[model samples]
Target: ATPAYDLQKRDANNYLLTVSVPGWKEEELEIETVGGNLNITGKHTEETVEDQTHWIYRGIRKADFQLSFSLPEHAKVNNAKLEQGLLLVEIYQ
Candidate 1:
């Protein structure tokens, strides 16, 4: 159960998407665009504690989040980057 993304339409032909992907290194995140669709995939790894099962309640670990968005034919995927557990993607026309 990973955290969801916050997608915002900057304008009629631009969009900004932000997602939280914890425990993912810089090399684990990827962004790609194909046939007017934007695809995002990322993997996260979590550490396990020994003899601490009872202390744990509800938690999410080792989550894979994938998101896709349909972009206009004239839209352009500007750039994408991950920083401080946050992945930011910018798209424009």
Candidate 2:
């Protein structure tokens, strides 16, 4: 499932955005700002049993997921980092 985001307006020029993504590493995350939108995507990179073999049951979610938001014309992705499954993004004017 795609993670949910928490947005915080810090000031007139910046906003703090956080999204919790447990079991997803920093290297698997992709952040991009394009066409007045901020897009965040992640894919599970762990090696699992080959899908070619028959599977009895599947409970884990290793599917690719994404979330996006439209930003103001002045909004820019200043910096972003991941810590404790929280993707912290800082936007600036």
Candidate 3:
């Protein structure tokens, strides 16, 4: 399954965005802001198996995901970083 994200408005002129993704290194994530839109993308490494299993059961928890947000006109984004399975985006006026 894809990871989830939370977005909160810090104030009238700024916003905070966070994404919940596990097992992803900091260098594997990316973010971009253009034309008032923010784009977030990340990749996850899949586990490798030696032999094929007889009965294979899968869980809904191993998929890559992305998130995007549209910032207000007055909002200015300064920096974005990922740490401890969470991506933090800072925006200010």
- Candidate 2 regions exceeding 4 Å error are 49-60
lDDT of 3 at 35: 74
Model 1, 28-83: lDDT tens digits are 76767767676767765455674677657545466666678666756665555444
Q: Which ten residues in a row have the lowest lDDT in candidate 3?
A: 54-63
The better candidate by lDDT, 1 or 2, is 2
TM-scores for all predictions: 0.55, 0.58, 0.56
CA-lDDT, candidates in order: 0.59, 0.62, 0.61
Q: Rank the candidates by TM-score, best first.
A: 2, 3, 1
Candidate 2 per-residue lDDT, tens place, 1-93, comes to 655557655555445555554466668877677676767777678686777556566554567776787877655556655445554555567
Clashes of 1: 0
Which segments of model 3 are wrong by more than 4 Å? Answer: 7-20, 49-60, 78-88
Error of 1 at 61 (Å): 2.5
- Model 2, 91: alpha-carbon shift in Å? 0.8
Residue lDDT tens for model 3, 47-90: 67735584385433666776787767566655555445555555
